[PDB]
Write a protein that binds this ligand. Structure first.
Ligand code: NA
Ligand code: NA
Ligand code: NA
Lengths: 236, 230
């Protein structure tokens, strides 16, 4: 990712160094009065919110390279009471106090705009998820998640398009599709295996009918086409 | 909104004139090869999309002053097949080609930050809505839409928080039967009341209880407006 590699250079030039986090650590947390800009260079994270009683809500997933800002750029105060949790085994991120970020986006607008554009991708991703859910419900949500996982992590193999993630847990898949409890996911994964859209084998989902997923996640497929044409192009 | 009025002046200083739109017009549409930055100065709009069958979906609502960009700032291509439709009687907007927005935000980083922060409000708004839906379902979504109406248009009165929006506009805010039952249930329970041709919120705490993450979003995003009624 060319724009991401250029942004990594600009940060290191300016003396910001990558940090390594391991699974379950919070890159930023909902109780911290200091807010940050996170350049997630490598790894998979999720955004969570934790209620007073302990219930964890999974709100959004990100993969490196991406940018996540916990505070508004002008006021520097929280945009919501959120954590960024590492769900891959390891992740690498540049962690920038928001006041320090402003100075740096100041003097190089090429990078101001790279971050701007990521927020736009976030916005339209949330709208596409809402639009697919409104039409095809939870079933379409899960198709969407399988679809994007296939675009990003699929390898063509004799068994289908293998979704090549470690510990791709059924529970994590449901959370990414906006569904909390496993009773609903089981139903849907059962139908998808039944109609022979997916298969489970080597700890992995294989996708054997990619067109069926496109069919039920049309607005997320359109988002991927519009926002990630190069990746989309690999399986179209 | 001081930040927004300063942006309006920046636009005009650079020669950009306001355009006027009427209800049901599209300020931008999903078929135009040119994408735009809309500075919606006055009025109420909705973002819409069309499914294969020709069914229209209402995705989001925006009120002046706000910024809505139909294309990515770097590549200038569509963020999604979306239309921006006017819902108030009238709307005033500044309509800027994306390439020209960049040059404009380049010269002035106060206004750069103003626009950037509207994206951030959008992002967080969507997540707050989703969180509320994941706790209380469609009932929470509707409580949350009325909560933001109350904070944005409400004025305290002896009869409660009057919603200072014309009635025709107010009811809309397509025509799902399940939505209409939710609204009328809040009326039945006297959370919002019709009196003397106006609508009054008489139980704000009830709305706050069922749209807690949207209430938090407004506190964090618009603390002064939140504060007026809390
Ligand atoms: Na924080
Ligand atoms: Na357009
Ligand atoms: Na107050």
């Amino acid at each position: 990712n060319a724009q991401a590699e250029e942004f990594k250079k600009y940060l290191e030039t300016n003396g910001i160094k990558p940090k390594q986090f391991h699974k379950k650590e919070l890159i930023f947390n909902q109780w911290d009065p200091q807010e940050y800009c996170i350049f997630l260079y490598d790894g998979i994270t999720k955004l969570t919110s934790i209620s007073e009683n302990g219930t964890i809500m999974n709100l959004q997933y990100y993969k490196g390279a991406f940018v996540i800002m916990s505070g508004f750029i002008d006021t520097e105060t929280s945009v919501g009471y959120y954590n960024l949790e590492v769900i891959s085994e390891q992740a690498t991120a540049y962690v920038i106090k928001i006041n320090e970020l402003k100075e740096l986006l100041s003097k190089n607008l090429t990078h101001f705009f790279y971050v701007f554009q990521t927020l736009q991708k976030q916005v339209s991703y949330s709208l596409a998820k809402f639009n697919d859910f409104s039409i095809n419900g939870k079933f379409g949500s899960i198709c969407g998640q399988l679809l994007i996982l296939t675009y990003v992590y699929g390898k063509e193999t004799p068994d289908g398009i293998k979704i090549t993630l470690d510990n791709l847990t059924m529970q994590e898949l449901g959370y990414s599709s906006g569904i909390a409890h496993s009773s609903a996911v089981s139903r849907i994964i059962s139908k998808l295996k039944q109609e022979k859209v997916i298969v489970y084998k080597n700890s992995c989902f294989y996708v054997q009918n990619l067109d069926y997923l496109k069919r039920y996640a049309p607005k997320l497929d359109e988002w991927f086409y519009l926002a990630c044409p190069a990746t989309w192009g690999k399986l179209n």
